[PDB]
């Protein structure tokens, strides 16, 4: 039964192979060392013999790699050119100097080349490492991640009970600031029973406590908007999105008016208030609410959205909007 | 006279049995088992050897199938195929990821395919049960669906007077909530006389109590409103839309401003109050009413349906809107 | 003179009759026995063996035709493809499965094949007779059409002298309340003096009382605005449209603003109130008021609109609109 | 000189010769006794062997044309067939029923055939006399064309002194009701000296007064716009504009907003309120408008214009109005 | 180095050449002696064998041609042929009856052919006689130019003070009123030692008092738009328009909100409260503004315009807005 | 290693080389001398023989070149052809006689040809030169850049104390007013840790203070936009853009209201009110911001940005906006 399996896939496996292999092998050429070493949040390259490593306590750590011979513009333009087919794109110092792709093992990757760059020399490169541990909530609580609000306890029963209750929920923050992170700790609280659609770009959540359960990813042609409409035909009882970025948070708009069992969601924001305003701009950009009135946007979001997290770039909670 | 629609239909029933035979065969290899199974309203399937059954009481039942056969990635694409194929559509890894199509008897399906889903040996199959039978209303009353209003005497009058009158009604709530089933049990209260028209986009409703009928189905090219279009165009007493979903919901706010009479539909959303406004929303989305205010669309909707029944997840009115 | 009249029209007529006589044969082969029922409002076919036809009392009466050879799908198929090819359309099981055209003498036809229909055994076919008599107004008054109403006697003669001076009238209505033959009895008080131009989709209204007229008719390529625009370099004195439909509600709107000698038209609506709303709406659908205040055409039309009569579903006034 | 003129226009005068020759031949067989008839203002002929002339005073007089060859459809047509083709265009039994073209010397021609007109043996053509005569204004007042008003020897002097000194007036009413003539008749007003440009559809305006002017035609492919902007660059002290008719309403609306002198035009409105608002209908179809307020334009139409003269349908002012 | 630019240029000029001469040419032949008198403002032919001029005195002399042969159809169709392809144009009586074009030296020239013409034996040419000489300022003060104004005084040193300080300014008036000419004079007051940009349709503004300067024309492919946003990358101190028409008025109104360095143009305008209205209509006109409040252009275009000029047809200052 | 990055580029520098060369040549030819001279922000050429020279100062320095070859139009139009060709662009004396091109170092060049110039013997070239210092601030504040504020101490303190936190600041003024090289002083006062990413047009930031950091550039094909988007996908701690000048407006927008830290940018404005005028007014130039409140646009970014710094054209700071 593995066995036919193996047949059935063996000419996709193969083709996926051909991108794979060579990237895998470029990527430890490179940046081996680098993925290797841990409590780290990116990997950057600035064209300049420095590999700069941001670590989770907020620190840039430059390393010397002038003597590399993988630091090599050949051999850095190919790692590009592996990173680059892999996901079915193409990258040159023409009409295709910046590449947004991902690594073997799905981190995200931001290539830029000259004319972009200051010079022919200068390729800049940005990898996120994704949390590589999926923290319980329990250890958000012990390290203090609500200590700055006044409601700290009222907080703290009002994720867990909202959350168990299927309230919608929506953690904010900057780049960094641990939302992802946060979602899968409180992901706890959801019963053991309820079926779960997740909808991301990468592989990130992580199902430690449910059974039932599908994983969605966007990427290419397929939208997440696609994914989403996909997903409300899966019989979800909840929905984790992960990102909210562009186009579909008007479908995200009109699965809440719909009162859809329990959303969790992630969204760049500074502010609950903020929040509610980068919504209702990503809503609008939506030409299916040509129509809408954006300050009906706005009191349509206030409306539906029961609990809104945000996160400084200290990991901390430092608002904590209920209703 | 049964013999020559035989030989006339002989081209047409050939090549509609091309797809029915193997999808039909597909179908009872995997799924057969769980399509007896009495009292259940989604079979669920995650790529994981497991298959999922939502039952009528609310409980999520696994079953191990890893030692099936028709389980195998080969025996399940031949299924995914065979279901796209029955509905003029193609499946792939590429550009046709997500299939929304339906077996031999109509139940809806969903699949996903890698990329989409997590990885290439992972496969999502989702089917929508239809209720197998028609409660009469007297049921509903009896398991005290209405039991949670205080307007209960005063709502099962409601529904009884207004429908045999012709009142605008409209069911909503979430998928699954039982709004499809409910529909089908008050249509015992409009007129035996009264000609109806059915919209749908499989067949679900049933006629036990109208002798003087047509139903309508929206597919591939030809859109609801298309059929609602058509409908209007068949001297109908009473429009029954089993969904408002899209643009549609632009034609089906004219029909009620041209005073029509016993229209009857159903809806997602949360509350009477949403619904005016998944109404108007939905509505914006058609074109045709570029032009139109917003709060005009809302107030219309508010001065035309008369009555909306909303079920919780539990399957109970927990709000009986009336004028 | 009648003559060469037919020489010159040779090739037309010959045409014209290619289609006209299969159609002619297929419609008595079917409808025959129906199309000679008296008072009759609607004839149906549901495509199980039974003929529905919606009588002027408002019953409907069902006749079974399961013995007759030409209710069977070849039979029903053939006057289908007839009826398609008379008005230059096609039907099929593909992509035109919704037919509207036309009988010989005009009467409208609506045809629905599978997949639209529940099987592939089943036709649906809708024929809505025309009233075959011009009543005169004094019948209507007899038969108390305006008995329902306060002020009765008041109405009479604000009809009377109301279209004698060139008011704007609006008879609504729901689909057979009897609109149209309401407007043919009200043409009595137009001055036999006065020049008519009448625009249809069929012929329907008759001149018995005016000598000077021209009958317009909108169909496949040319729009009722296209006659609308003609009607008015034809030097009339009364329009008469006969039903507001779509786009053109513009069009008479912007006639209205010219304040025309004296208009009378037809549309579907449920109040007075509901009539400028319905106006509004078409009108806001065409393009050409894209930038026009939608609160501004319903004040405008209620402007000019000098008298709406509604009809309710007993063919009986229930709103006389005055100012 | 008027010589070599004649040779350098010789094929251009062949070739419209080759049209008007058979068109003015067609038009003498049909038409000529009835265009002879002296005090008419449309011609009609509505398929059925009779010819309708409506005469100044109001009154329709049929003649029978039932022995006249000339009236038989390949007479007719060949008519029509001759009318289309003389101003470029064709006119069919298919995608081309409705014609509006001109006779020899300019008479709007109105022409439908089947299947627009009721059957194929009907023709209907309706063409527009204009005034023969160039009324002087003392001729109006004498036969008390301001005696409706109140203001009546108040307005004399307002239209005098107005006109005399470049103030933005605007004759209005309904289709035949003068205004044409009676702009003529007020062109005694204007300084002898001022530089006068037309724009017309057909010659109609003429110049007993004044000896320096252009007159401009708008024609197929060439719009009132265009003549119009030409206008605007050929010096004028007056621009009289015999029709404001659909877009070119925002183009005259810029011209006023630049100041100009002396605007004179014409427009379908039933009053002074009316006409603004026809006004603020027509400019906002231009698309150059798509961002004003509506409300906007109307209070800017009413800042602008100076005086409106409204003629009823019994050829008499009934608003004078003025500021 | 005279020389080496004469063979570098040598195939331009030979290319401009066999365009120039004919048209020159004819010119002459029709018009020399027209061009040659003394304070005329427009050159008129209105093809009935006169040719009248406009003075500056605002009287309009005809003189008689009839004996003329350069005024024969001929003569006069190849003027207008040399004309239309001097500027890379065409002119015919077909779909290119209107000719915007220019005389060697740059005058406009709108030339009017059949069929927008009575007859086919008219042809309008119209052409615009800039001012030849360049008046000082104090001219201005001397012949009254100022007179009308109750702040005549306070007004002289408005524009003085004002132009020098690099405040924006707008001439506006009707075609003819001298605005050009004015802004020639008032340039006066510029600082010598600033950079000084016009942008113009014909040469027209001369640079008495400046040496650091750079001309500007727009014309066939190259707008408006295109001069101004040059203009901005040519360090300007001063960006002299000349007019305002169409698209642009956006562009020039951004370039106010960023608060360029003196800006000074022409309108054509009624007043100053029009100026603003015309700005904001022709500034909406710009899909740019798309989104753009019209009352907010309103107000933005008076919170940055410091000066406006109004000139009568009598060539005063009858307003002279301040702030 | 540096070997192989030469034969590896070996094919690209060639390439680039090709257009260098001859660019580099030419420039010093014409410009060399001026460019050698200190203290100027201009060089301008007005295609008459005299080479200007705007210094810091504000003075307009003439230079005679007649005598010089390097300054005859096929010498200069050369240089013109080298300039274009370096930026894969055209210039001709047809549809292309507006270039904005650079030279080999950077500097930004503005050439126009005839018909847009005055004549075909006419070149205007205008060429900005950067500062070529890095001046520190306390060189501001001892220069009196800050002496005309009343809040002069308590600025000085905003922008030292509000950079370091992060706060998002706006340097405004008119071109030539020293924006970009304050903005390159008070990167002083961001942390040495934080990583900086700019985006420019071409090179002028400099990095004396900070190790790590990325230099994005906007070409061709490549709009701002584009760099912004990556950008934010480079984990840059704070984002420096040299210029607002188009759509880019909203996308700046939406990274204020995601809460990013840190950014830091300029824009051409008169006044703070006039930068959230010119902010908004650029912002719905973006259709991404089709449906946005204008008004909601300017109080959106008056809630987001902390700090406005407008310079006058004597290069010292007359408003200091906080909050
Ligand atoms: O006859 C039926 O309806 C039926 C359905 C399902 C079924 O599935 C299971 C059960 C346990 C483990 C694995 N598969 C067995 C039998
Ligand atoms: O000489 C004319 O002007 C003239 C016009 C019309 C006319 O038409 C009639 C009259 C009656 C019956 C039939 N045709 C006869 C003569
Ligand atoms: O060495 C230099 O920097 C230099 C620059 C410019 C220059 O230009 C002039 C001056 C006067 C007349 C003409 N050209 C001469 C020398």
Redesign the interface.
Known sequence: ?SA??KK??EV??AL?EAALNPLRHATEELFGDFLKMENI??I?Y??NK?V?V?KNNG??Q?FDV?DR?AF???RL?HFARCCASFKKKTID?Y?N??L?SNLANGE?V?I?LS????N??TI?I?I?IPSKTTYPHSFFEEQGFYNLLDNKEQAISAIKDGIAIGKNVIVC????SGKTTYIKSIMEFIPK?E?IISIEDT?EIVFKHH?????????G??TSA??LK?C????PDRIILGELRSSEAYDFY?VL?????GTLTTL????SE?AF??LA?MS??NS?????????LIE?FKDLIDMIVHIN?HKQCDEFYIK
């Open positions: 039964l036919e399996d059935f896939l996709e496996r996926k949040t990116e950057c600035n064209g420095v700069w941001l620190e840039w430059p002038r011979k090599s513009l050949s333009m110092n009409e100097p910046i947004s995200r931001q830029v004319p972009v760059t200051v022919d020399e800049s940005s996120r923050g900057g780049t960094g029973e079926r592989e059974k039932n359960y599908t994983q969605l990813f966007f990427g042609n397929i696609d994914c996909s409300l035909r899966m019989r009109n008016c719909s009162g859809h069992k760049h924001a500074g502010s903020e305003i980068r701009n609008s950009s299916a609410a040509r129509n809408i009135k954006f300050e009906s349509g770039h």
